[PDB]
């Protein structure tokens, strides 16, 4: 793992969250909320787990990290907090 992981200081992937990453983050977080996971945001009455996950993503309170795998087997860890959600 030590050789596979690329150090944080020299990650060369895009700093923007991809559409697939956003889709899977929302799906995973919605599924976890649906299984009674703690919520890190205040709720304005929303009840759908998916839109709860969207609200969590809007203010970067999702405690997950993407492990982007390079073709050679190496990978980069990008926290959802630092990824820029532009799309």
């Amino acid at each position: 793992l030590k050789e596979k992981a690329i150090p944080k200081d020299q990650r060369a992937t895009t700093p923007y969250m991809t559409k697939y990453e956003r889709a899977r983050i929302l799906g995973t977080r919605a599924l976890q909320i649906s299984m009674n996971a703690p919520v890190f945001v205040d709720l304005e009455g929303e009840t759908d787990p998916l839109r709860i996950a969207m609200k969590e993503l809007a203010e970067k309170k999702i405690p997950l990290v993407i492990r982007r795998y390079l073709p050679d087997g190496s990978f980069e860890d990008w926290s959802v907090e630092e990824l820029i959600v532009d799309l």
Binding site: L31, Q32, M35, P38, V65, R67, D77
Partner: protein, 171 residues
């Protein structure tokens, strides 16, 4: 003998448990499953060294399940008996077929075939013992034994010891 080795264990956490005390839950669940345990691959597992910072890594959400698969790496102190190794111990029980000696956490059964002929069982003694011309082996008696045969089961390691060789017996 007592060693310390680098072990890893895959734990899975339910979505309900992901809270600020997740590290505590992972550390506790490593215990109660590895502490005091026995495996055939590495012998007994007695304790885990370096509790202050156990490498828990990141964890991995299982798709369609939501549970996270952590691969917790740690240092564990183990006791793996080996064939043909001399070690001290104490007798706890005796019988017709042989007697049991307590070495660390394991019990080694020395069979009646693997004692000098002068040493013979005696059930008349209370508790029953093994008596010879020069010495007697009873309960709570120190004895040095050489392990010559090990069968590696998982939840119960079984070893065969003997004192037939020179300078083996009571100390």
């Amino acid at each position: 003998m007592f060693f310390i080795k680098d072990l890893s264990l895959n734990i899975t956490l339910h979505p309900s448990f992901f809270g600020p005390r997740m590290k505590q839950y992972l550390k506790t669940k490593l215990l109660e499953e590895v502490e005091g345990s026995c495996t055939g691959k590495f012998g007994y597992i007695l304790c885990v060294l370096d509790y202050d910072n156990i490498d828990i890594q990141r964890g991995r959400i299982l798709p369609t399940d939501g549970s996270a698969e952590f691969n917790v790496k740690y240092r564990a102190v183990v006791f793996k008996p080996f064939k043909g190794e001399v070690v001290d111990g104490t007798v706890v029980s005796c019988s017709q077929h042989g007697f049991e000696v307590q070495v660390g956490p394991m019990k080694v059964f020395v069979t009646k075939h693997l004692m000098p002929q002068d040493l013979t069982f005696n059930a008349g003694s209370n508790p029953p013992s093994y008596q010879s011309s020069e010495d007697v082996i009873t309960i709570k008696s120190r004895i040095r034994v050489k392990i010559e045969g090990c069968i590696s089961q998982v939840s119960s390691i079984h070893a065969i010891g003997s004192i037939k060789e020179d300078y083996l017996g009571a100390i």
